[PDB]
Amino acid sequence: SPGVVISDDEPGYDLDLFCIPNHYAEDLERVFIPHGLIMDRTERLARDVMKEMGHHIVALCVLKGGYKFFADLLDYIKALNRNSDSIPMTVDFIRLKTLTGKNVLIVEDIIDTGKTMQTLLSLVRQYNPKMVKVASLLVKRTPRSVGYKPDFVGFEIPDKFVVGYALDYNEYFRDLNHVCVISETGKAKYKA
Numbered sequence: 001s002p003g004v005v006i007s008d009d010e011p012g013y014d015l016d017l018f019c020i021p022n023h024y025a026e027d028l029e030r031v032f033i034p035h036g037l038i039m040d041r042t043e044r045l046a047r048d049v050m051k052e053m054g055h056h057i058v059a060l061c062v063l064k065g066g067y068k069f070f071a072d073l074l075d076y077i078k079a080l081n082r083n084s085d086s087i088p089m090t091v092d093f094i095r096l097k098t099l100t101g102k103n104v105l106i107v108e109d110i111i112d113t114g115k116t117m118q119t120l121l122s123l124v125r126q127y128n129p130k131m132v133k134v135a136s137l138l139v140k141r142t143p144r145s146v147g148y149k150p151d152f153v154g155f156e157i158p159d160k161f162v163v164g165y166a167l168d169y170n171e172y173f174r175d176l177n178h179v180c181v182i183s184e185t186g187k188a189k190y191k192a
């Protein structure tokens with residue numbers, strides 16, 4: 001319900017324990033969530049979603065720089081639907097930097113302070129959909145948060161800036177499949 005909780009100590013296996021590209025060896029300090037681990041968690045997230053909404057849904061995929069999460073999640077949802085009825089499913093998008101009388105499912109990669117999603121919920125509520133639930137792979141424990149909690153959470157992680165899987169850093173760490181903590185060497189290196 002609160003998701004897979006990663007404690008402040010000791011979170012994230014060491015870098016040497018998982019395959020990491022040599023060119024990112026110094027730009028990361030610790031790995032929080034290995035790729036296959038995100039996969040298995042997302043799979044169950046597809047089930048949790050499907051059993052929370054049994055009426056043709058609209059996958060409203062929050063769209064910024066990445067696609068991985070909502071691509072994987074929707075793949076697993078498509079795997080579930082692959083047994084039962086000819087179930088339709090519309091996937092929509094919202095770019096950040098129609099749904100009225102529909103069962104909507106907002107998909108986001110990570111929530112830090114919450115404002116982003118909170119504001120996103122307001123805009124959507126105005127169109128008066130039948131119901132709106134939110135799914136977020138990551139929800140960061142931080143005093144900078146406004147209190148908003150998603151309906152579906154993949155993992156809860158320490159207040160660190162992570163990259164990988166679906167998260168980037170100035171168009172970098174795209175080929176990094178692991179959600180890891182970026183080090184100070186990386187921040188300065190890939191600074192805009």
Ligand SMILES: NC(=O)c1nc(F)cn([C@@H]2O[C@H](COP(=O)(O)O)[C@@H](O)[C@H]2O)c1=O
Binds near residue numbers: 109111162168
């Ligand atoms: N490590 C992070 O918290 C993070 N990493 C990224 F690569 C991108 N973000 C982006 O920061 C934005 C801020 O979200 P927020 O309004 O603070 O909940 C989010 O849209 C999120 O996608 C991160 O928060």
